[PDB]
Amino acid sequence: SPGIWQLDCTHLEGKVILVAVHVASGYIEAEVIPAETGQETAYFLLKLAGRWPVKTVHTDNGSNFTSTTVKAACWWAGIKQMNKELKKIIGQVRDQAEHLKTAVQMAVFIHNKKRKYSAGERIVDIIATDI
Amino acid sequence: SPGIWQLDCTHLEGKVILVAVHVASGYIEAEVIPAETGQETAYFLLKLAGRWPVKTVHTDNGSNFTSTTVKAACWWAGIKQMNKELKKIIGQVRDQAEHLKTAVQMAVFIHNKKRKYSAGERIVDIIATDI
Ligand SMILES: Cc1ccc(C2CC2)c(-c2ccc3c(c2)CCCO3)c1[C@H](OC(C)(C)C)C(=O)O
Ligand SMILES: Cc1ccc(C2CC2)c(-c2ccc3c(c2)CCCO3)c1[C@H](OC(C)(C)C)C(=O)O
Ligand SMILES: [Mg+2]
Ligand SMILES: [Mg+2]
């Protein structure tokens, strides 16, 4: 279903990478955050929900979503309730950039543009077809 | 044309808001940054280019794009070279959030979802039709 996203954090070089996957397409958005806090998750959810029609979010660590701030973001935005493949690409490009966050965005770019159509093409088509 | 984006910064409460507009659709993405630096622009461009097929970027301040770092981001990602309407929405929601960045993302959400189809629906349809 086109409104379903998966959200998890993974750890690399002492930092935290927030990873959202549009399950139907494999399309990813990621951000490096200082550490795993409800406030960072909430803010990320608000950002994500303004870009895509986010209906439901799943996670592999349900305690991620217990904070008052996360609950508020989901309430306002109308939301109801690959780490290895992305880490692979990050490793392939890591030497080309100083900052981990730079390498993360290169890896998201490479993943979303890779033809199996690409994840970036699939999400756009899935969402348009739903309209 | 579906690959064209506009990128500018605007100022509010002593902070800097980076605003990207998909010109064909009116769809917006925004981020609050500390101040206007080439590095922040470069990083934003890398993020944007992994989400959408960004072909060309325009700006109203051409000196925005002179830094070595911006040029590198455009090179790697294959890129070649409303402030009032968004400030209006930010003012309408500003009291509901502590942080300006939170109010900015609420305003992006409201803008992209507003039916004139919405900007969010238009960009997804324009991009899918181009495929
Ligand atoms: C810190 C820094 C300094 C200089 C550059 C470019 C040669 C000028 C880049 C950079 C700029 C763009 C770029 C890549 C690297 C690698 C390929 C993708 O595009 C970065 C970069 O940090 C940001 C925050 C992005 C400026 C990094 O972490 O090394
Ligand atoms: C700093 C802070 C504290 C508490 C909350 C929620 C009641 C718990 C929110 C919040 C959380 C979600 C939310 C809105 C506000 C307003 C409507 C949209 O959704 C924020 C918030 O900061 C972030 C970084 C987002 C946590 C802010 O700037 O006030
Ligand atoms: Mg997690
Ligand atoms: Mg500007």
Author numbering:
A (entry chain A), B (entry chain A): 57 to 137, 154 to 188, 194 to 208
Authors' account:
In addition, we refined a cocrystal structure of isolated HIV-1 IN CCD dimer with our lead compound BDM-2 to 2.0 Å resolution. The contacts made by all compounds within the CCD pocket are very similar, regardless of the IN construct used. In addition, the INLAIs engage in extensive hydrophobic interactions with IN CCD residues Leu102, Thr124, Thr125, Ala128, Ala129, Trp132, Ala169, Gln168, and Met178. Thr174 makes hydrogen bonding and van der Waals interactions with the tert-butoxy moiety present in BDM-2 and shared by all potent INLAIs reported to date.
Integrase (IN) is the essential retroviral enzyme responsible for insertion of the reverse transcribed viral genome into a host cell chromosome. INLAIs bind to HIV-1 IN and compete with LEDGF/p75, the host factor that directs lentiviral integration toward actively expressed genes. The primary INLAI-binding site on HIV-1 IN is a pocket at the core catalytic domain (CCD) dimerization interface. Acting as molecular glues, INLAIs induce a pathological interface involving HIV-1 IN CCD dimer and the CTD leading to hyper-multimerization and aggregation of the viral protein.
